[PDB]
């Protein structure tokens, strides 16, 4: 995915499939098909984070 999202809160990964982000991070939204968890790229890391904890930039 090429779209960007702003991390609204800090979030430490709770499972192997999740990824960690700091508030203010600009992440690349890879997949937003799931209503609750969006897959994002945090710099050079990849995984899921709660959709409600990020904000699409467009």
Curated annotation (Swiss-Prot):
Q: Cellular location of this protein?
A: Cytoplasm, Cytoskeleton; Cytoplasm, Cell cortex
All residue ranges annotated as the SH3 domain in the record: 1-58
- Residues folding into a coiled coil are none
Q: Which domain of life is it from?
A: Eukaryota
Would you identify the family this protein belongs to, as annotated?
Belongs to the spectrin family.
Briefly, what is this protein's role?
Morphologically, spectrin-like proteins appear to be related to spectrin, showing a flexible rod-like structure. They can bind actin but seem to differ in their calmodulin-binding activity. In nonerythroid tissues, spectrins, in association with some other proteins, may play an important role in membrane organization.
**Complexes and interactors:** Like erythrocyte spectrin, the spectrin-like proteins are capable of forming dimers which can further associate to tetramers. Interacts with ACP1.
Task: Return the protein name.
Answer: Spectrin alpha chain, non-erythrocytic 1
Which species is the source of this protein? Answer: Gallus gallus (Chicken)
